[PDB]
């Protein structure tokens, strides 16, 4: 997993640890993508009551991963927040609608004004699931402004997209540091 780690060393030099938000609604695969790393250390934790977040900790950077569906307890890591990676089951038409609601009310919290987006169609290797512009279309990706933001076609699992994304996404993250 050191093809992994050797990208996020591009993150090397920020003068304050970075974070990145792994979210969106359950079973769209945000673990799989977590452990599919294989980099630095995982460690779950319960700050608050029936919240559970998913924690990946690589050389100054930090990975959160929680299921979505505001509790305030959260606005706890938009701070350091750099960029969100958005976790969607493309074999979910029903939820769909759910996502895109809690998508936005989390890209309207203040404290995440900068932070790039990553949405990840997941799951494109099941029957039945909407392509990559199905669900760029399906969460209005196209209205949201003034953002740097990105899709991506992606099957966790075997491992497809993921790097192509978070290639993507690290050297935003980088740029927007500088
Ligand atoms: N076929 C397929 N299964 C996936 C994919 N991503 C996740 N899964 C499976 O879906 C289930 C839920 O994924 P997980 O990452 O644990 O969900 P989350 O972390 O709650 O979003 C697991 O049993 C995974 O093996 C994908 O892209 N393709």
Not at 61 to 66: A, P, Q
Not at 133 to 146: A, F, Q, T
Request: one cysteine or more; hydrophobic letters at 40%.
């Amino acid at each position: 997993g050191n093809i992994f780690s050797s990208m996020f060393d591009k993150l090397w030099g920020s003068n304050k640890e970075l974070r990145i938000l792994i979210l969106g609604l359950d079973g769209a695969g945000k673990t799989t993508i977590l452990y599919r790393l294989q980099i630095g250390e995982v460690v779950t934790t319960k700050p608050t009551i029936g919240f559970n977040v998913e924690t990946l900790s690589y050389k100054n950077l930090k990975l959160n991963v929680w299921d979505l569906g505001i509790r305030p307890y959260w606005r706890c890591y938009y701070a350091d927040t750099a960029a969100v990676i958005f976790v969607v089951d493309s074999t979910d038409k029903d939820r769909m609608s759910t996502a895109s609601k809690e998508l936005h009310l989390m890209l309207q919290e203040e404290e995440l004004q900068d932070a790039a987006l990553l949405v990840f169609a997941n799951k494109q290797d099941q029957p039945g699931a909407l392509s990559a512009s199905e669900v760029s279309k399906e969460l209005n990706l196209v209205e949201l402004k003034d953002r740097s933001w990105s899709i991506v076609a992606s099957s966790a699992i075997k491992g497809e997209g993921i790097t192509e994304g978070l290639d993507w996404l690290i050297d935003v993250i980088k740029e927007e540091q500088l």
